[PDB]
Amino acid sequence: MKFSAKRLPSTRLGTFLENRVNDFLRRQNHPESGEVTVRVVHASDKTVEVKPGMKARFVDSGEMAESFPYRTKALFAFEEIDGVDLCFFGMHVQEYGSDCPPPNQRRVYISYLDSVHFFRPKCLRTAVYHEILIGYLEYVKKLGYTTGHIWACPPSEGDDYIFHCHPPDQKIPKPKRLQEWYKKMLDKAVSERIVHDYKDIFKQATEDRLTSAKELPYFEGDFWPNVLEESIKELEQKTSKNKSNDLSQKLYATMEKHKEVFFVIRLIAGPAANSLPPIVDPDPLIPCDLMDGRDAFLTLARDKHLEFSSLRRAQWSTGCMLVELHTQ
């Protein structure tokens, strides 16, 4: 096709990921694998606003910024199977640069990732997912991002993060299996000396000596900002007849209850982390309404009856997805 994955415009980030993946596959020399293309298909600037409860408590008193700028990116990976492109992996990320106020400075957060399980061969599928995620971590570490953040959260039964209508036999992993999948990825990144270490959110808070909710990173659509609003509302209902840091107390209790699902990934440790030059992303903005957040691509798939529920339909929906991205 003139409208194929390869023909999408290149980026430094996407070239870096696809090089790392195809290096890995060539080394495996499995006769069923195909070439992998990776493309960034959206990049734009955004802000995340501190919600009303935290704003009244921290923003209005001058203690915390009112909002946090970031860049969002969407990227997708494609394999050649029978000479045709199959989109098999997608990811949306938020990147908070060196200009961003604390506590968000130099952090990346994975918003959503997703897959369609037809990568060939099956036995290298997980490895390839891992290479993409490790590659992203390596890449942002080199720009000078110091910390990665993952919320391990499977989609609900019958729901789709990125790709509309998954195969009926592609199973959603249970939380513990997913948590182990991320640990396996992160142990490999640690052994390649990309990741220095990683910690659950609770342990990390304790080790950073977090004494106020304002010190907690505040991301778009993440669990912690909602938690903080519900906790402030609970606290404000309290009265006491006659004869503080109570938010912090509740945050800690909630962090401990859920610590296993929130990964804090240190990419740059020690004094190296404190003398860094400004983060400069060499890649340009990529406006693309279709891939600005997850919803627009889910809608278009529904409208045009695109489905990722078999090899043939996913190959079909990849082709139409590509048509649409050159087209728009």
Residue 238 CB contacts under 8 Å (≥ 6 apart), including other chains: none
113 contributes a contact to ligand QSD by CB under 6 A: yes
- Among 31, 62, 168, 270, which residue interacts with ligand QSD (rule: CB under 6 A)? 168
| Helix 246-257, helix 201-208: angle, nearest 10 | 140
Instruction: Return the number of the residue (113 or 143) whose C-beta is nearest Cl ion.
Output: 113
Residue 222 marked ligand-binding = no
Residue 188 CB contacts under 8 Å (≥ 6 apart), including other chains: 130, 134
Residue 156 marked ligand-binding = no
- Among 58, 129, 145, 262, which residue interacts with ligand QSD (rule: CB under 6 A)? 129
- The partner residues of 81 in beta bridges, in order of sequence, read 84
Say which residue the tokens 């506590």 belong to.
103
User: 275: which DSSP letter?
Assistant: S
150 contributes a contact to Cl ion by CB under 5 A: no
Question: In Å, what is the CA distance from 22 to each residue of 27, 98, 128, 212?
Answer: 8, 31, 9, 45
Point out which span in 20-28, 137-145, 151-159, 236-244 binds ligand QSD (CB under 6 A): 151-159
Closest among 228, 210, 207 to 219, alpha carbons compared:
228
Out of Cl ion, ligand QSD, none, what residue 221 binds, judged by CB under 5 to 8 A for its kind, is none
Contact by Cβ (8 Å): 75, 40: yes
Instruction: Return the number of the residue (170 or 249) whose C-beta is nearest ligand QSD.
Output: 170
Distance CA 217, CA 50 (A): 11
- The percent of the chain in helix, strand and coil, each rounded to the nearest 5, is 40, 20, 40
Residue 125 marked ligand-binding = yes
Residue 172 marked ligand-binding = yes
Residue 57 marked ligand-binding = no
91 contributes a contact to Cl ion by CB under 5 A: no
113 contributes a contact to Cl ion by CB under 5 A: yes
Point out which span in 65-73, 140-148, 170-178, 190-198 binds ligand QSD (CB under 6 A): 170-178
Out of ligand QSD, Cl ion, none, what residue 263 binds, judged by CB under 5 to 8 A for its kind, is none
- Among 51, 84, 155, 227, which residue interacts with ligand QSD (rule: CB under 6 A)? 155
The least CB distance from residue 153 to ligand QSD, in Å, is 7
Q: Give the other-Cβ count within 10 Å of 242's Cβ.
A: 3
| Helix 175-191, helix 125-143: angle, nearest 10 | 60
261 contributes a contact to Cl ion by CB under 5 A: no
Question: By the criterion CB under 6 A, which residues form the site for ligand QSD?
Answer: 113-115, 129, 154-155, 158, 160-161, 166, 168, 170, 172-173, 177-178, 181
Question: By the criterion CB under 5 A, which residues form the site for Cl ion?
Answer: 112-113
Positions at the binding site:
113-115, 125-126, 172, 177, 181
